[model samples]
Target chain A: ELPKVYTENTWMEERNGDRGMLKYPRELDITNVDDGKSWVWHSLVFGSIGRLGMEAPKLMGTTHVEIRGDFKMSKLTPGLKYQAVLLCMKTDGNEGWDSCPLNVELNLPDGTTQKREVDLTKFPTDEFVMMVLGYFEAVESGDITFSVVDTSDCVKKGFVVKDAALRPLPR
Target chain B: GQPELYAENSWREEMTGEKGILIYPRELEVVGGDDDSCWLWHSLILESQGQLGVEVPKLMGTKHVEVHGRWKISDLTPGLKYQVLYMIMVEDPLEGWENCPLKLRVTLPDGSSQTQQVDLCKLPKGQLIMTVAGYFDCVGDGEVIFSVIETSDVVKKGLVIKDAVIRPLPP
Candidate 1:
């Protein structure tokens, strides 16, 4: 009885078991947030109530917000395509993003990178939205470094992020 | 090219019996719409998210706008949970919603409620999508009321409401 490592950082989607692995915020590298002044951690987050331990983060008045992490493809079968996305939300006190843009970059293990630009204002508030970073096939090296960047001269606020996932494409 | 029929004639359920339903514009209990002045319905719009059909409401010119609907939870399994969402798309890229926030409510027969404020200016425009409103469990079933209510005194424009949907969730 190995206790199943329930606290492990990644898990498959309960609704769609075939989707690729998903990593909780605890498993990622979020920059400039640990000091506790620019971001607020919430014990209660939508879409993570029972699975991700109801944990997520809220961005405050910060000029820069970047989250970076790698995904292991051990469980993701070969010959199928996968996409990475940031599961996030806009909460109250959210502003300063009317014309702002966030960047999502994925550095594949093959030494090649793919990137996409996402506008934070395009996602509705209170609900968790998928900010598609980029997509790729199952890689041979198993690890890919992906990051969401929000470096700004102006301060942005109130973006709630739950986790990131490399899910199988929906038909 | 012809525009896709975006709205349904009435509340449409999941085709595969997957436990979901859509409440369209024609069925909305539009506040102050008895004279049909607060809102208007269009014959066709763009894009369809699997569930097909035409006619969507383009909400325009209002200081405070609200739309209400209700559904019987009797159709849902006794122990399962379902998410209620207000599906809409941002239109005209207009003003007053930059700082103003909208509210969504789902009240169960047990008197418990799940309600929150939603920021529209943060959401992306140009496409219709189902955004979160709230959720409820089907326990001792009765009519479940859900609503989209404006919380600010500021005027807002161009919110193309596609439909309201209650979709099943994993137990």
Candidate 2:
């Protein structure tokens, strides 16, 4: 019998629901529409844990990184309360390591730049392609800004040197 | 008067005979026109290793022509190999066939080109999937040409997998 040459402990789970899970090997082929070339990257999705849910810190897969989160919230009724969960991971610092910086950019009704950091904890989940981490939040009619400060780790990881796919919550 | 259809060789006689093969028109009325002229095109289909006959009902000096042809394959065989051999000359032309010999080359998907009298066909042993196509262009009208090709020597059947089970733990 031929010996197994390679093995990995990776799997996929649908967050916030009991949807069936999927299994994927090392890389996911995300294609470049311009030249038809594709790139593969690691990804994560977030959800809650309860009686109808699972526990936190589950070892669904293995990666060499850790993430941390801190944020502020507003626009709620006087004494209203909420909770936010953060998914954190560090860049693997492999051959092609790249990091993405997070920033907030708010626009006014007159289309002027009014950038500020709104608390991301309020939002449920933020989806980042490969190496970048994202936070979601909910806010009021006030304005805010979101931007990437640094992407050194991501760039070094050979991640695509392009803009991350991020958007703001509706007030 | 209605427009006429033309073929490089006549397959109608064989189609009408007992030992002759069945001829199906691939498509009808392909559009061709600029400002002053308009032409319609159609194609013919026959099984592999089957005879191909060309017939032209009417002739015009500066007209348009189009043909798309292919062979039928019931299934793929293992280690089957074959090739295509062909020549194009006007059996009846306004100009002599000596001066108007068909000049063209065949290019394969692997970026290989050949100027042989026929196309080379080969199926690697244990190879399962393959795609083939024909590309041709004509300069003048009232000319007919046909192709004679071969197929693999082996006959093989395909099988389908069953009961690929997958389960996920409740989360």
Candidate 3:
């Protein structure tokens, strides 16, 4: 299967004279498998949106970012197992203070839930880095949606914003 | 439509200088052009015993155990003389250091060993099917091996199969 990565950007913008940054990019690196008919969210990395400062912003991290890729499964192999790994981390470590365990919650197409935690610091850049996000499966010929949330907060201190990245590995 | 063949009594062991599992297919009947009772046996033999050093729960007295793949044969070319050969390999980072054993013994209903090496190139103009299995080890540098073989006459010499079209079987 040929896999392709699709990415979108999110940033804070001035709207209606109100200044605010995007909480984080609703970013997703979706890999299209089986000729685009069946696609898997191969990687998901939630972003952190902090106010202009070196400390944390009240809930500066991402939360409740939903991702849904609409595709038909008629072209995919029946019973073929498909999954995606999500990675979330600060490229410069100094921006987001107070490190936390990489947490992930997976929602499958068949209405099931699976959760996993990954240590982004100790993760293998090649494969394990993306595992923190979550996984997806095409249970039948239908659409699948994947979502992630960053539960870290900065309620007590100012927020520091930095570049965050995501990675994906073939299972 | 044919019923799916389940694996039964599967186990992996290190033998000689290689490692792999001995696969036994559950008995099932299916219709083909020439219908006859047949046995499907699959295994992954490594190049050297050192290739598989990790600890995995054993199945039936064998360590490094797993069900590799399933196979089916309707009617053997009666009296045509054929041997079943499989390319053995280990999925580890050591690279070249791991290799799978190269043999598949197809037993006839009457209990006869039709042994052969796993080769992909020299087949008797028939059907070719494959399933990709992932890494067997959990730690260190990870690498995968290409396994290819064919059902052929035992008298044929040299490595008959050239290459295995390897693909990522996502977890």
Candidate 4:
């Protein structure tokens, strides 16, 4: 049996919004596991929006927005292969610009990291889009830190981000 | 027969995410209307997470986000005084900034305009908040236009806006 871990629970920590501009921009920093934190993750020069939902965090921007979450992997089935995926969407008004991609990096418990890229623009605009990061094998029980970054320079607006999860990939 | 006329609707036209230099900025725009010509509005920035509820619009940024809606007085009760109010809320991350104010403007049937300011920083965050634009007495049947503008320069994030309505006030 494969057990999945959700980042919106009580075990996630994140720092969001811009901390250099406003004196209390960090006040916009959200760390709630129940509802994911939303903010302008990167430079204020490029604008974006962030929020937490019932299942995951929702991020939207035309520029680059970065989000990070930590999940404990102690409950996973030992020696199972799992893949990280980001649930997202491209809605109306996302025309003209095609290469919106998400760069995701994972930090495992063994002091090693994994990285991959998922193109967000390839998905249908009317439904939820899934972007896989990479697959990893669980050798021991520990924690995993995952980071998702949207560096797309496309002028098109409207990229909806739901959640990031580590699911068991069929062997 | 001086019954007051009450009519309310979402935004119409288009919602744009380009507010100055910001990309994927959260703002509401009119997409389409119902069979009754009641326009339905949604955010230009789609949240990965769903709305807080069915009635709440997506959370928006507090910088230059503007939404406008129009309705014909012929659809409302005639010869009665009406109050225009916009329901809003300040969500987490953007909830820390105190004294952030929003401006509301309404154009009456007589081509006269009225405006008011709402301080979003002082209101309860994550809850439904209401602000009155102004009161007007209907002289005759015509179309009235109303708008809500984020007037604060604090550069905060996360503002949830609902529909705008004109309700009959006791004469």
How well is each residue in A1-171 modelled by candidate 2, as lDDT tens digits? Answer: 111111111111111111111112111111221221222222221211100111112111222222222222232222222212122222223232212333434332233543333222222121212222222333443332222232234332222211121212100
**lDDT, candidate 4, at B22:** 8
Model 2 residue runs over 4 Å out of place are: A1-171, B1-59, B63-76, B85-93, B96-98, B117-171
State in Å the error of residue A39, model 2.
Answer: 64
Candidate 1, residues B56-150, lDDT tens digits: the string is 55665677688888987896656666788786666664567876677779888888888877677766554444456787777776899999888
How would you encode candidate 1's per-residue C-alpha lDDT over A10-90 as one tens digit per residue? 333222334356666666788876777787766541121111123456787888888898887666647678867776667
Clashing pairs in 1: A121-B122, A122-B123, A122-B124, A123-B123
Residues B3-75, candidate 4, lDDT per residue (tens digit)? 1111111211111111001011122242222211222223322232322212234333333456676666666
| Docking quality class, candidate 1 | incorrect
TM-score ranking, high to low: 1, 4, 3, 2
What TM-scores result for chain A when each predicted structure is judged separately against the true chain A?
0.83, 0.23, 0.40, 0.58
Q: For each predicted model, how many residue pairs clash, with residues at least 3 apart or on different chains?
A: 4, 43, 33, 4
Off by over 4 Å in 1: A1-19, A45-53, B1-171
Error of 2 at B73 (Å): 8.9
Model 4, C-alpha of B48: deviation from truth (Å): 23
lDDT of 3 by residue, B19-117 (tens): 112221221111110211121122211222111111111111111122222232221111222222232222111111113323433343333333334
Error of 3 at B88 (Å): 25
- Candidate 4, pairs of clashing residues: A38-A50, B5-B77, B11-B30, B12-B30
**DockQ: which is higher, 3 or 4?**
4
Off by over 4 Å in 3: A1-75, A87-98, A124-128, A132-137, A155-171, B1-171
